[PDB]
Design a protein around this ligand. Structure first.
Ligand code: OGA
Ligand code: MG
Ligand code: NI
Ligand code: ZN
Length: 331
């Protein structure tokens, strides 16, 4: 069995290997990359996402989100307070202000220490989940707006044509902006490209151990667990690496830098934080290997998770017994 310790793997495809996206995902899996839940892909030196980032300041962040924490430094939830719209140039200036900028630090490990010590005492503002793309239309390789759609994959594997669309999302971050512990909708893959700016640190639990994380989370967030049998679908709970280690939960960590891709694999729980002003693009995708994960994915039916239009068909076809309850939670 390849990668039996479930380490995060880093790949350096050549320009020739970068042509065929599906084939390269399958290659990475042949080497055991999925066992980690997360892989890094460093593009060939010949590749670029677009020519420059000099002309992005007028993009609008219609609903910036202030991430307010409650709890203790290593075990907390966050809620999202909506703020007034602002442009990317306005947001960048805000991120660089004395109130929000990255503190002085020695290296990524020192900054990680500072994040976990101090995150809860601040409320950073995240420009998350903005439909759009920064890939040039002429970029033919690993262009996150030109991937095969999940609806087409389901149709190819299962024969059933379904409604829905699959487009990318932009994320504008600042110091301490945080993504809570989660797997993707319907335990899909994700791919994330860090277009510009400061790094993003990731934590991940191997898919084969995801239920260990869920059991810890039920213990640590006991009111939330009573409220909902899949409350990590709410995307609000954080648990630090120190707490994970104290409770024997298997996990790994890695820092993504500008110009790098990360892939999350089906049922790979992940969480993390941004080092400073940055912009990422991400989208969900599927492969044949996903189908069995989609059929077994947990679902939130309490009302909190509320998701896209396109998840309806995935539940309806892959999980018909759960469909009626889940759709009630949507309405
Ligand atoms: O970058 C973020 O805030 C969160 N991204 C992801 O969870 C992802 O790409 O799957
Ligand atoms: Mg612009
Ligand atoms: Ni994710
Ligand atoms: Zn719920």
């Amino acid at each position: 069995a390849q990668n039996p310790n479930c380490n995060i793997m880093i790949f350096h495809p050549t320009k020739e290997e970068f042509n065929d996206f599906d084939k390269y995902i399958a290659y990475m899996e042949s080497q055991g990359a999925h066992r980690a839940g997360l892989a890094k892909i460093i593009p060939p030196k010949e590749w670029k996402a677009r020519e420059t980032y000099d002309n992005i300041s007028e993009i609008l962040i219609a609903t910036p989100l202030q991430q307010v924490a409650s709890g203790r430094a290593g075990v907390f939830t966050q809620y999202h307070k909506k703020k007034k719209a602002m442009t990317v140039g306005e947001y960048r200036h805000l991120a660089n202000s004395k109130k929000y900028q990255t503190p002085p630090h020695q290296n990524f490990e020192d900054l990680e220490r500072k994040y976990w010590k101090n995150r809860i005492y601040n409320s950073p503002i995240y420009g998350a989940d903005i439909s759009g793309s920064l890939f040039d239309e002429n970029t033919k390789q690993w262009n996150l707006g030109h991937l095969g759609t999940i609806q087409d994959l389901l149709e190819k594997e299962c024969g059933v044509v379904i409604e829905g669309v699959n487009t990318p999302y932009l994320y504008f971050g600042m110091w301490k902006t945080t993504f809570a512990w989660h797997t993707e909708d319907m335990d899909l893959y994700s791919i994330n490209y860090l277009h510009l700016g400061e790094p993003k640190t990731w934590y991940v639990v191997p898919p084969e151990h995801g239920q260990r994380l869920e059991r810890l989370a039920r213990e640590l967030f006991p009111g939330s667990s009573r409220g909902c049998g899949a409350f990590l679908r709410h995307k609000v709970a954080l648990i630090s690496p120190t707490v994970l280690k104290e409770n024997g939960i298997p996990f790994n960590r890695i820092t993504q830098e500008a110009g790098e891709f990360m892939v999350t694999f089906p049922y790979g729980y992940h969480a993390g934080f941004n080092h400073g002003f940055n912009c990422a693009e991400a989208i969900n995708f599927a492969t044949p290997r996903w189908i069995d994960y989609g059929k077994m994915a947990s679902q939130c039916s309490c009302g909190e998770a509320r998701v896209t239009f396109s998840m309806d068909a995935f539940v309806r076809i892959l999980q018909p017994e759960r469909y009626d309850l889940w759709k009630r939670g949507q309405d």
